[PDB]
Amino acid sequence: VATLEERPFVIVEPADPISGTCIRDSVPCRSQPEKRCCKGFCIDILKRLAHTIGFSYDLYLVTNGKHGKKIDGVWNGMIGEVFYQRADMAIGSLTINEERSEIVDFSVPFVETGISVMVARSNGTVSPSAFLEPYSPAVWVMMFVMCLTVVAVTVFIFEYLTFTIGKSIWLLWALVFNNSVPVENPRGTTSKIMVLVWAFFAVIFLASYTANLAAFMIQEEYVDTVSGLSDRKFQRPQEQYPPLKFGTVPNGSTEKNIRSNYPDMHSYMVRYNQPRVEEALTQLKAGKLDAFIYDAAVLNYMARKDEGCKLVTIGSGKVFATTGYGIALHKGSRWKRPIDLALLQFLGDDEIEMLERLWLSGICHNDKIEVMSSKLDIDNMAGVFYMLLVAMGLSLLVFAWEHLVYWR
């Protein structure tokens, strides 16, 4: 069996020198060779198949390339170790490909791989039209209508002892709006009592408004953004807002797909060509970049295992050109049916899921599951300023009418 050392899949560690022999729960993988053991995710898949299928093995790390490659005539790496009769299987982080499928045959995929997108965590807006929200237009409009009836009643109910309608509107509107303005009060007890009844509604109305306004920006979650690879905002940024910066690791499977489909993608993305996966995250975390694009099965794991949980992907079923992993074979090895039957058994059962809660997991949750309430800023409440701006313009309209009435 040929294998490659990868961070979440196959971890190779020195054998315990204190006990001489290597630690348990590991396989004695040589190299091509001091005695040495390794562990990880794909290792556990291999050892489970050994118990089920009933076959032995002798792992050895490949020392030629990475997951196999074509050098225009010779196949090297993990795949080449199987294409050249050297290795019977190539369990590891092997992406199923059309080109690899015609030189070696694969098994049923046990891990899904695609082409995903990263982005920094979104803080979350506050629905900039929130001030009119904790109510209904039926309640909003009719409450204005209700006061017009009460004001008309109050003038009539006070006439039967200089109030007039103008001061009644001013007085009644004052109470409903956290009374602080100058007011003129009536003298009759029938009108004075009625105002108190409207005053009681003013307390309830104000209390209800501020109570529900709190609830609006408490049960609101935080996603605020979803983007796709095929979207034009990603496809070409030169005909839109300041360009979105995104790059990948060239010379790999993700570059082959991004080259064949969109040639302009390959031309544009070389501006930000990060040669290290970890380094690209730092640039993304520093605001230099805006989206890192790579395989889902290797980028979801790094998104899950991350302090602060500041990196969230949008590869929730939007992975493009999705080909799973698998166990390579010899294209005639007659192990394909037993391997596929056993591998489907774990997938049919809930076996692979437990190994996913293992190394291919992290404390950070890509799902939101978190709500944040920040400062209201200016954008999140600029709507309430627009209502005032209407009044200043509307007052000027009345000013002209107040001026032209005398002349006509």
Partner: protein
């Protein structure tokens, strides 16, 4: 406890006035393993020694309690001589022949049950998590939090903008002075009663009205945002037992500790799923359970995996600590003795008999379940959080002090 003068245990009384019965243990003092010590009489008392006394009252046998030498509960480990495994602590003292009966908190398991008999458990408990109980502190700064620090300075200009507009909308239409518009525009916003100049025109009324509606929303949105920030933002770092993802994976939740050569270590060894978690704490496991609890109060160790019968006692006395999680390994203790022990049939029967007599309930009532503070998180606003507001009004006094002298000088 150290023995008092004359080489005898000091006289003490319980909560009910009964004498707490004491025995003269003959074991090491100020152990500090790795340094020479000597045997010395010591005073012992408590739960597992009262149950011992009632045991001696039934089988009519005498005893002389001597504490363990090394200080570890016991774990079969291979010596440096090839792999000849040899026990340690109590188990070494019992198998060798120096000890005959181990009456102490001693979780039973296969590795220990193969060489000795164990009798029925005298108390049922599991393993929980002990962490520092964080005091509820409100993470609220001054009043600058609900609104962005780039919004107040634009609201303030809007107060003046309405004031100049209102005065300009009243000195031209067919009244109020400029100062009245300044007070009225403010007086609505801060809800103060000052300001006696109401708008007169039917065009100045609406501008001074919709501004009032805007004043309520600003204050109401302030209340809603403070409520949203206070209710939502609470310190949630609680651990729901070993099933918590932080425990389930190697993470730097400071340190997870246990006691070396205990049942917890072997429980963490036979489970290969968390084998590296146990190897993680192999460089962090203490030499005693008493020291580790002291580390939690020192904020050097915000975790502990120890018998729940012990932690709950500390979570009641040292009320600055709290227990968390669900008991994930339930196994009773045992009065273990050597194989082929004539006392084995009597001892197990008396332990089972004591359960229904009510005596076995009595012991834990005096020792473990006399109860203490529990409480067990809505933070309260304090002067530290609200000091910003008091500073402003304190500065208002001195702001007016430098303003009165320039106000009077205006007349001259």
């Amino acid at each position: 406890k150290p023995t008092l003068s004359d080489g005898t245990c000091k006289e003490e009384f319980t909560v009910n006035g009964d004498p707490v019965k004491k025995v003269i243990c003959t074991g090491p003092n100020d152990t500090s393993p790795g340094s020479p010590r000597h045997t010395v009489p010591q005073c012992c008392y408590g739960f597992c020694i009262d149950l011992l006394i009632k045991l001696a009252r039934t089988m009519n046998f005498t005893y002389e309690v001597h504490l363990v030498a090394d200080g570890k509960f016991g774990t079969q480990e291979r010596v440096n001589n090839s792999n000849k495994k040899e026990w340690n602590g109590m188990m070494g003292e019992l198998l060798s022949g120096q000890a005959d009966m181990i009456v102490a908190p001693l979780t039973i398991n296969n590795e220990r049950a193969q060489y000795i008999e164990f009798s029925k458990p005298f108390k049922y408990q599991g393993l929980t998590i002990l962490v520092k109980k964080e005091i509820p502190r409100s993470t609220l700064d001054s009043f600058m939090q609900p609104f962005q620090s780039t919004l107040w300075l634009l609201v303030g200009l809007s107060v003046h903008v309405v004031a100049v507009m209102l005065y300009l909308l009243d000195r031209f239409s067919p009244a109020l002075t400029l100062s009245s518009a300044m007070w009225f525009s403010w007086g609505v916003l801060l809800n103060s009663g000052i300001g006696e100049g109401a708008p007169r025109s039917f065009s100045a009324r609406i501008l001074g009205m919709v501004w009032a509606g805007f004043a309520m929303i600003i204050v109401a949105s302030y209340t809603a945002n403070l409520a949203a920030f206070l209710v939502l933002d609470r310190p949630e770092e609680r651990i729901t037992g070993i099933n918590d993802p932080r425990l389930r994976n190697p993470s730097d939740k400071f340190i997870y500790a246990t006691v070396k050569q205990s049942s917890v270590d072997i429980y963490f060894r036979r489970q290969v799923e968390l084998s590296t978690m146990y190897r993680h704490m192999e460089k962090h496991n203490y030499e005693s359970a008493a020291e580790a609890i002291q580390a939690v109060r020192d904020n050097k160790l915000h975790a502990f995996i120890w018998d729940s019968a012990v932690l709950e006692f500390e979570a009641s006395q040292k009320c600055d600590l709290v227990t968390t999680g669900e008991l994930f390994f339930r196994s009773g203790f045992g009065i273990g003795m050597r194989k082929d022990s004539p006392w084995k049939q009597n001892v197990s029967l008396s332990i089972l008999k004591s359960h229904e007599n009510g005596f076995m309930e009595d012991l834990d009532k005096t020792w473990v379940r006399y109860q203490e503070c529990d409480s067990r998180a809505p933070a309260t606003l304090t002067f530290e959080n609200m000091a910003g507001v008091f500073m402003l009004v304190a500065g208002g006094i001195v702001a007016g002090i430098f303003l009165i002298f320039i106000e009077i000088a205006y007349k001259r």
